[PDB]
Amino acid sequence: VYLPPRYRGRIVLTRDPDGEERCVACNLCAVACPVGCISLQKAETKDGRWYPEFFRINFSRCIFCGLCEEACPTTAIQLTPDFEMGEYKRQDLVYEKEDLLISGPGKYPEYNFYRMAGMAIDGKDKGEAENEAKPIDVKSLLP
Amino acid sequence: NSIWPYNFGLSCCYVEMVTSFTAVHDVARFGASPRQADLMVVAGTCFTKMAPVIQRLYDQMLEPKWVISMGACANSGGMYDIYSVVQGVDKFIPVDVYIPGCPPRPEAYMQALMLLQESIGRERKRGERIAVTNLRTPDEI
Amino acid sequence: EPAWQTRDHLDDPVIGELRNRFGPDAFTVQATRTGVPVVWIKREQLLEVGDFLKKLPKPYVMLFDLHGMDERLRTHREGLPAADFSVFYHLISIDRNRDIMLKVALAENDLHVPTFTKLFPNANWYERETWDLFGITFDGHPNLRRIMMPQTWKGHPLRKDYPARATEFSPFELTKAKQDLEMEALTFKPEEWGMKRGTENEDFMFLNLGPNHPSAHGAFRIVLQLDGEEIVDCVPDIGYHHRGAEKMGERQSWHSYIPYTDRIEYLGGCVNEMPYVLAVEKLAGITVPDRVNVIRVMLSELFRINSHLLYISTFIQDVGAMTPVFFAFTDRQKIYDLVEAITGFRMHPAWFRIGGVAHDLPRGWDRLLREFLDWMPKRLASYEKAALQNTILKGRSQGVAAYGAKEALEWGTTGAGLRATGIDFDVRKARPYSGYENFDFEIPVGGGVSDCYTRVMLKVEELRQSLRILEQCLNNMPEGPFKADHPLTTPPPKERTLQHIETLITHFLQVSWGPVMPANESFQMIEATKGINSYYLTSDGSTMSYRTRVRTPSFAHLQQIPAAIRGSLVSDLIVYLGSIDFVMSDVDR
Amino acid sequence: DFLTEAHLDLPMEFESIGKAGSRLGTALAMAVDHEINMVSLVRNLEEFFARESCGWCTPCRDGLPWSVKILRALERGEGQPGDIETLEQLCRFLGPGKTFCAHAPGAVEPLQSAIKYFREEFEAGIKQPFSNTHLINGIQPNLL
Amino acid sequence: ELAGIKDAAPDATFRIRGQKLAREPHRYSGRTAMRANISVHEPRQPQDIDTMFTFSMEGNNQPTAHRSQVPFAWAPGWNSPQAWNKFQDEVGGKLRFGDPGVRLFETSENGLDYFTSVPARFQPQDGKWRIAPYYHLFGSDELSQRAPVFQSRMPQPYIKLNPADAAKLGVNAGTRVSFSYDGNTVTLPVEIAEGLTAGQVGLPMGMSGIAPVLAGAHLEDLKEAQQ
Amino acid sequence: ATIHVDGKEYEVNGADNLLEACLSLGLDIPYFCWHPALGSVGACRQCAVKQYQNAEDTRGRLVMSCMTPASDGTFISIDDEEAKQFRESVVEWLMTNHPHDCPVCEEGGNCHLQDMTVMTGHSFRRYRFTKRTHRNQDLGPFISHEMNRCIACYRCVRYYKDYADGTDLGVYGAHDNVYFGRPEDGTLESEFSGNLVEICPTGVFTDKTHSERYNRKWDMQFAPSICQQCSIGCNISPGERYGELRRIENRYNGTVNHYFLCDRGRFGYGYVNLKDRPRQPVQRRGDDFITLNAEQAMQGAADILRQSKKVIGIGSPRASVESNFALRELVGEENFYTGIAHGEQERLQLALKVLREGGIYTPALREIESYDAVLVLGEDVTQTGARVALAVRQAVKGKAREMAAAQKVADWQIAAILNIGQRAKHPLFVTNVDDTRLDDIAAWTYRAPVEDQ
Numbered sequence A: 001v002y003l004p005p006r007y008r009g010r011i012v013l014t015r016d017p018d019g020e021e022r023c024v025a026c027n028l029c030a031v032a033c034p035v036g037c038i039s040l041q042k043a044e045t046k047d048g049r050w051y052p053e054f055f056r057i058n059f060s061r062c063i064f065c066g067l068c069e070e071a072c073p074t075t076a077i078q079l080t081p082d083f084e085m086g087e088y089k090r091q092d093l094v095y096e097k098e099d100l101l102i103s104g105p106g107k108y109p110e111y112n113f114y115r116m117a118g119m120a121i122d123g124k125d126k127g128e129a130e131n132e133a134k135p136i137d138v139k140s141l142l143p
Numbered sequence B: 001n002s003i004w005p006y007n008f009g010l011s012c013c014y015v016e017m018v019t020s021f022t023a024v025h026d027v028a029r030f031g032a033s034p035r036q037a038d039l040m041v042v043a044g045t046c047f048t049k050m051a052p053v054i055q056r057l058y059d060q061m062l063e064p065k066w067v068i069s070m071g072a073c074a075n076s077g078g079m080y081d082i083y084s085v086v087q088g089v090d091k092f093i094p095v096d097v098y099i100p101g102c103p104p105r106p107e108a109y110m111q112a113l114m115l116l117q118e119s120i121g122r123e124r125k126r127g128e129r130i131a132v133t134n135l136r137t138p139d140e141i
Numbered sequence C: 001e002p003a004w005q006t007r008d009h010l011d012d013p014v015i016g017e018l019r020n021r022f023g024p025d026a027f028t029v030q031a032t033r034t035g036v037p038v039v040w041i042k043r044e045q046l047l048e049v050g051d052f053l054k055k056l057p058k059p060y061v062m063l064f065d066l067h068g069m070d071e072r073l074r075t076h077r078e079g080l081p082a083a084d085f086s087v088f089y090h091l092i093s094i095d096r097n098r099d100i101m102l103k104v105a106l107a108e109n110d111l112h113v114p115t116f117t118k119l120f121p122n123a124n125w126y127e128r129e130t131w132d133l134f135g136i137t138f139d140g141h142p143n144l145r146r147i148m149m150p151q152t153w154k155g156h157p158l159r160k161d162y163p164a165r166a167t168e169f170s171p172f173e174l175t176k177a178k179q180d181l182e183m184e185a186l187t188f189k190p191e192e193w194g195m196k197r198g199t200e201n202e203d204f205m206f207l208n209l210g211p212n213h214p215s216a217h218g219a220f221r222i223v224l225q226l227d228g229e230e231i232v233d234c235v236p237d238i239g240y241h242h243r244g245a246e247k248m249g250e251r252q253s254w255h256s257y258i259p260y261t262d263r264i265e266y267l268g269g270c271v272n273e274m275p276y277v278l279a280v281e282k283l284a285g286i287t288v289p290d291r292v293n294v295i296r297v298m299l300s301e302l303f304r305i306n307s308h309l310l311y312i313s314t315f316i317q318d319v320g321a322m323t324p325v326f327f328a329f330t331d332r333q334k335i336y337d338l339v340e341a342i343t344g345f346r347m348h349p350a351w352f353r354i355g356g357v358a359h360d361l362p363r364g365w366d367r368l369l370r371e372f373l374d375w376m377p378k379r380l381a382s383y384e385k386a387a388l389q390n391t392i393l394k395g396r397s398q399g400v401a402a403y404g405a406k407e408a409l410e411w412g413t414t415g416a417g418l419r420a421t422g423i424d425f426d427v428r429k430a431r432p433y434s435g436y437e438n439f440d441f442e443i444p445v446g447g448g449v450s451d452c453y454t455r456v457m458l459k460v461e462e463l464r465q466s467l468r469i470l471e472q473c474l475n476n477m478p479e480g481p482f483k484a485d486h487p488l489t490t491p492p493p494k495e496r497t498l499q500h501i502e503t504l505i506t507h508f509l510q511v512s513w514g515p516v517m518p519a520n521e522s523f524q525m526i527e528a529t530k531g532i533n534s535y536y537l538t539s540d541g542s543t544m545s546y547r548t549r550v551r552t553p554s555f556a557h558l559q560q561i562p563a564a565i566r567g568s569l570v571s572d573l574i575v576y577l578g579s580i581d582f583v584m585s586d587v588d589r
Numbered sequence D: 001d002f003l004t005e006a007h008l009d010l011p012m013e014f015e016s017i018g019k020a021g022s023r024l025g026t027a028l029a030m031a032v033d034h035e036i037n038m039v040s041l042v043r044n045l046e047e048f049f050a051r052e053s054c055g056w057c058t059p060c061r062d063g064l065p066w067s068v069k070i071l072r073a074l075e076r077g078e079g080q081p082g083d084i085e086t087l088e089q090l091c092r093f094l095g096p097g098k099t100f101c102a103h104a105p106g107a108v109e110p111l112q113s114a115i116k117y118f119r120e121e122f123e124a125g126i127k128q129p130f131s132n133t134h135l136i137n138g139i140q141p142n143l144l
Numbered sequence E: 001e002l003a004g005i006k007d008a009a010p011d012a013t014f015r016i017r018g019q020k021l022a023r024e025p026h027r028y029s030g031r032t033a034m035r036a037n038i039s040v041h042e043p044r045q046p047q048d049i050d051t052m053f054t055f056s057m058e059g060n061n062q063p064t065a066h067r068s069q070v071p072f073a074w075a076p077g078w079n080s081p082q083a084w085n086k087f088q089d090e091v092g093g094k095l096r097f098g099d100p101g102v103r104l105f106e107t108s109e110n111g112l113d114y115f116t117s118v119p120a121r122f123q124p125q126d127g128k129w130r131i132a133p134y135y136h137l138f139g140s141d142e143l144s145q146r147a148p149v150f151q152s153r154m155p156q157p158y159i160k161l162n163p164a165d166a167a168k169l170g171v172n173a174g175t176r177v178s179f180s181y182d183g184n185t186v187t188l189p190v191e192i193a194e195g196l197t198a199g200q201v202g203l204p205m206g207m208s209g210i211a212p213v214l215a216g217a218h219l220e221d222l223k224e225a226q227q
Numbered sequence F: 001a002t003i004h005v006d007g008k009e010y011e012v013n014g015a016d017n018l019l020e021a022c023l024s025l026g027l028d029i030p031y032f033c034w035h036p037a038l039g040s041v042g043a044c045r046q047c048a049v050k051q052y053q054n055a056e057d058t059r060g061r062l063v064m065s066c067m068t069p070a071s072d073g074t075f076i077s078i079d080d081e082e083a084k085q086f087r088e089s090v091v092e093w094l095m096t097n098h099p100h101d102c103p104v105c106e107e108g109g110n111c112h113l114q115d116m117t118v119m120t121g122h123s124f125r126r127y128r129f130t131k132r133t134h135r136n137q138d139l140g141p142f143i144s145h146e147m148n149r150c151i152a153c154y155r156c157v158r159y160y161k162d163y164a165d166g167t168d169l170g171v172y173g174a175h176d177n178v179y180f181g182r183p184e185d186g187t188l189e190s191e192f193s194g195n196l197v198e199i200c201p202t203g204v205f206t207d208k209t210h211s212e213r214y215n216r217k218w219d220m221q222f223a224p225s226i227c228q229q230c231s232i233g234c235n236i237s238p239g240e241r242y243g244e245l246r247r248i249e250n251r252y253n254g255t256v257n258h259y260f261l262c263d264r265g266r267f268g269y270g271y272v273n274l275k276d277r278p279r280q281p282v283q284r285r286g287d288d289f290i291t292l293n294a295e296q297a298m299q300g301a302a303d304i305l306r307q308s309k310k311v312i313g314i315g316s317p318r319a320s321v322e323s324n325f326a327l328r329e330l331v332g333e334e335n336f337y338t339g340i341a342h343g344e345q346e347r348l349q350l351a352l353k354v355l356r357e358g359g360i361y362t363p364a365l366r367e368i369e370s371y372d373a374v375l376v377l378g379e380d381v382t383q384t385g386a387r388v389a390l391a392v393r394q395a396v397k398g399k400a401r402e403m404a405a406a407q408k409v410a411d412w413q414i415a416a417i418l419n420i421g422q423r424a425k426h427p428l429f430v431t432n433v434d435d436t437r438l439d440d441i442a443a444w445t446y447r448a449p450v451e452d453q
């Protein structure tokens, strides 16, 4: 069986070129879902990094529309060509981040949202984003 | 190794697995009613009107009976959390094997038959899916 | 004119006639973004305006749609009479390529309207459904039973004050609804279903034909009244495939509702989301580029070919004898592979977006479509000649359930039912939509009678034209965007929202709260795989629809069945059901 | 506003120079000789008018730096199509009444007045294809 | 006397065009998955027989609705707090259709008499310290102080003292001090208060260990911490 | 009092600006720096509407809605092509320097800048150059600080300093490098600084108490509730998600706390999320605790209470009108004891007597901003009920408004009203045992014992 690169398949969470997970827990995929089968909570790493505390997707309701993947602004969640096993209890069809978080970057290999964002994390400082200038202090001498 | 499925597919799930037998062992080689059935396959949306029909077709078949709930509409409601749809076949029928998708591929039904017959005679499948580095980009064919 | 601007049709020869015959105060013409003049008639002048429209130089000879609307909670209703509920009648005329939408205002207490079942006979089921979903009674209806919900229902779903979500499951109510069926399968009284009680010496068996049969795409529970083995009267019993899809449009934003449009009537992937997307584009004010138009017509042609192949094969096989055209299903799978390579979803693609399309076509769709257009034509020719030279088909299905232009007009029949009587009315050619006008394809019609054989032959030569449209699409696909640059396109082209803050803000708000469509009303009528269906959206200025009315064709095609087969045998009814292209999800929405 | 050599004979008073397009300010003229690139001079003026502003109103505070950056790119040779048409849009939207004070209406007078008379020296800097995105890998760009 | 609390808000069965008022935005997310870890069969939405609101979105929250109890401000295109412009008749004015409150009493015709009781001048007693109430916004409320966020914000316990009376003892600016009011012997640091009248001591009212009832009472003995 | 907006003819109060009147009529004009409580300053320039005259001037002039008097013979047009383009370009200029972080912003689906960017129909970036960046400050344990997202609308500074009299927040720098924060890291001293989380249109000032356990606005579940940390009835709207109170937002009430809360009420809500709160009725069988049902608890309690020689009840002054009553009914009228000390109650019923039986009108919380003189005799109003302190602060600025209205200055031009005042205030005489927070504005403070006061 051959499946198109097209996402339809089994939702999956990916990681950026680094080791860190892509998701930033903004809830843009949880609200765009027609069915309402995504439910997460944002937690904050020590320095500044947003990440999902728990991520949970009800696969007994998911219709695999692909609206979630289309809404995610950080390319964290994607639809990959593979089907879920048909579980026995229906309770075991609720995936909880541990199951979903893949080891790789998925379809888009080099995109790093936090290289674009303007807020500081451990990696990048205030003036180290993409197309950004070093912060000029108001107490400067230059006019 | 003897199952004669009575496919109760209502909605687009039915016409999606219209060729379910293709991936079958005993059927399609002779040697069709719920009165002599062993396996019921609920595939389409479970409406508040078809529910008595489904329940009576369940009580007509005899006790060594296993029901498979295909699709995301039979499992739990669906995208249709609406006033006229029962929110899952398991609300009134004890399901044995669930299958996700909208609609699921015939491979899913084949694998469901195998997985159910293995009950008589993610955690177990997580390592493979969890750790895949890269995928084919959506730009070719 | 941008082809979507709010315009009242005061320069339309029909409102001038309505003014000449009723005076310039009997109605108020509303300015909408539909293509039809919306006049607000009074309840008392309804039956004398409808008949006047029916009797004209070039009359309005089809009632296309008739449903209510709940206005109790509607802020932006300027230029409209005071109303709580309202019923609208969209009358189609064919001799002049024009439509008109009458409207009647209603109060919550005095909630009733005279019945249209005397002018246009295809208003029986429409009024039954309007009374089922809204509490609007119709004074003078033959029988006004609930058609979509069971008779034991208590509320009226489509009202505003009715929760649109499933309620706690009721096992004892399921128990009662299951036991009472098996018990009261005892007296199929003619009076409740309107069957006049027979003669008491004929077959009073009242066979509830096919509660679950593969000929009809669903339960459909048709009830029969036979005298010998003839039918003398039959009433269909629908409602068994009704997932609330018009009330769901009021719970989902303009963007999230697209998968529901796909499920409205399966077998057609993008054919069903084309009218919704074009109607919400009218509501927004978007004019998609040429590339989007050609992409949409290519996808809808692929799905039309798919559904036509399935229908032809199923009828040929189900008549009793057939050549092993096992492959046509193989070709269906092939088309599905193409749709999967393009949209990524195969079945229910949910590809069409507001103001464009989800992705730009894949890099290798050219060869993918060219191999298909080189593999299909000879197969279809074989397909056309085997279905014609098969005399068993021309014997078992010829003159089985025949009606003429008059009946097809008065029962709301469209598609291949119509257009086989000789009424060359096709939406692609009459009212071109989504850059349909730029293709060369002749619309096949029939001569006089319209029976099963003629309908099937028409759907057969309705394939070569779809293949010609596909070949033209492949030969000249314009270069340009796949999403119209417009502040309301949904959502903004990804590669920009991933790196630009304005586009990110737009995408954020459009997928979180939904796009804000300004207050207005829109309508789009297309030619579906089986008949004509259209979306009549009403935006109250919010981020979701205030009302979504889907006119599906299989409704009227099923309503016509009792009139079409009276004095015919049960096998005639079976081949009739096998010939009218209909789906039960299409019927019940 | 800049003025060419033809306007050199009109009397130095408010009405005459006001009708000639320019405006008599402190009546202390400046003569720009041929060896001065106009884009460099207008950049030197707009960077003063942008760095010397205050922060109160958006059109000045946030639009003068954009003109400064466009002019730096034009004098470096990294202009792009839509630059001069973006500068001209700044001369209409920073005019009198659109900003809180008169600093920006006068700040954008030499710019438009140099564009009018010497557009060639501004176009000569546009040597790039407009591009603003970075081509994310898995997304196909929206074409034109 | 409370006959006016019946009009403070409409009772249950109050509907807006049949609909009851909504507690959640229309696009409330994660409805079939936010309770999935406990059980995948989602429960019925909770029933609110008490009031006119529903614990769901199947309700009504429109700017032009004819009620004065608004759960939140949202209008199409105006997501933020600025959505309160659509809910008031004139922006910055009262909420359209009035404001949700009923004064129980209205000003009387005739007033009280003059209270002919002037208190005598405060003369400080030797060996007794009248407690002057010092109230803090953070930490002076019984329930707010329990918030783990106010622990960072609330001040440290202290006992303010007049310099003329801090120097009268040996205590200086930060020395702990023990004092007895009842059975309890509290020991708090000392801060100098130049504005406080001499024969008084300050105490943070409400702050744990000091009951607000300790306002006007006099602690009988105060001395150094006796370490 | 009869303006013409886009051909239509409306009736407006001719005493307020065109932005206020057009927003009261239901029309949609974008605006960042106007606030219906802080007057109008023409800083952001984003509420531009074309203004004609003669009803036949076909070439009007762009003018800011919030600064034109909206007099009788006024002809404007919100939808003019030039006005549309200017309003759009005005947000484009703000977007030139914005940080690509909506996903990580504390306020998505709640941001006013997102609303106005989607409203002006701007969804395409022509800017190409670098953005200016800023370093943040530590403002306290309540509200955060992300100066990258500032659009320099001046609402924070105007509110915090001219309205609430903060004295430790202002603007620094100039020329597109402007900065709004504290002079140095440290906690914000003002009691009413929480309102900066909603006064600021962008996500620069966002509260930490919600930022820790965050949830987008749509996910929240609100209900009309009343602040319970103070004697005033400030109308709040607390939001819940995943079964715990996430934040407390302000709920407009044009008679009590129109737009502003305290910090004790906005941030002191964390006592409902405690993990030690009682969640089931338990019984102490000697030394052990056994969890009971609801019916079990009621049956047991009634069985023990029915065998009692007398049952008394002690209600509190923080329950509700029913909870106390309900209890009163359970124990008898006689056995119901108000859970406050004798002296705590005597001077509570005396205050109630002064309010009821004393023929003097007790103003609402917003009517306090309309009184000439104030005598705060014995109360630390800032620390006990602080919204009354903000209302008094608004009342003492009344003399500047009188001086401005005597010179025919409109009541929405706040800059001119303040400039005409020049630290001239109505008399206010506070009185307390020690210094207060209303001494900077008071004419004289009396520091003395509660007998000398």
Ligand code: SF4
Pocket: A022, A023, A024, A025, A026, A027, A028, A029, A030, A040, A071, A072, A073, A074, A075, A076, A077, F103
């Ligand atoms: S999956 Fe995507 S949209 Fe959802 S929270 Fe993570 S980054 Fe946001």
Ligand code: SF4
Pocket: A011, A032, A033, A034, A035, A036, A037, A038, A057, A061, A062, A063, A064, A065, A066, A067, A068, A069
């Ligand atoms: S693809 Fe599945 S999980 Fe994602 S939005 Fe659609 S239904 Fe929900």
Ligand code: SF4
Pocket: A063, B011, B012, B013, B014, B043, B044, B045, B070, B071, B072, B073, B074, B078, B101, B102, B103, B104, C263
């Ligand atoms: S699960 Fe999907 S394909 Fe199957 S019946 Fe339901 S909506 Fe149709």
Ligand code: SF4
Pocket: D053, D054, D055, D056, D057, D058, D060, D061, D099, D100, D101, D102, D103, D104, D105
């Ligand atoms: S135009 Fe004037 S007021 Fe506006 S920012 Fe420039 S100097 Fe300041």
Ligand code: SF4
Pocket: C505, F098, F099, F100, F101, F102, F105, F106, F107, F108, F109, F111, F112, F113, F114, F149, F201, F202, F203, F204
């Ligand atoms: S302040 Fe508003 S526009 Fe700016 S990043 Fe945050 S949410 Fe987006």
Ligand code: SF4
Pocket: F149, F150, F151, F152, F153, F154, F155, F156, F157, F180, F199, F200, F201, F202, F204, F205
């Ligand atoms: S910090 Fe906020 S309120 Fe202050 S100027 Fe910037 S955007 Fe406006």
Ligand code: SF4
Pocket: F227, F228, F229, F230, F231, F232, F233, F234, F257, F261, F262, F263, F264, F265, F266, F385, F386, F387, F388
């Ligand atoms: S003044 Fe402050 S503490 Fe008192 S009720 Fe209002 S918000 Fe709550």
Ligand code: FES
Pocket: F019, F030, F031, F032, F033, F034, F041, F042, F043, F044, F045, F046, F047, F064, F065, F066, F067
């Ligand atoms: S709101 Fe009027 S200038 Fe900013």
Ligand SMILES: [Mg+2]
Pocket: E048, E050, E051
């Ligand atoms: Mg309750």
Ligand SMILES: [Mg+2]
Pocket: F015, F016, F411
């Ligand atoms: Mg005013």
Ligand SMILES: [Mg+2]
Pocket: A120, A126, F135, F136
């Ligand atoms: Mg920093």
Ligand SMILES: [Mg+2]
Pocket: F136, F137, F138
């Ligand atoms: Mg810091």
Ligand SMILES: [Mg+2]
Pocket: A138, A139, F172, F179, F182, F183, F184
């Ligand atoms: Mg500083």
Ligand SMILES: [Mg+2]
Pocket: F107, F196, F197, F198, F199, F200, F201, F202, F203, F204, F205, F206
């Ligand atoms: Mg903020």
Ligand SMILES: [Mg+2]
Pocket: F325, F326, F329
């Ligand atoms: Mg009671």
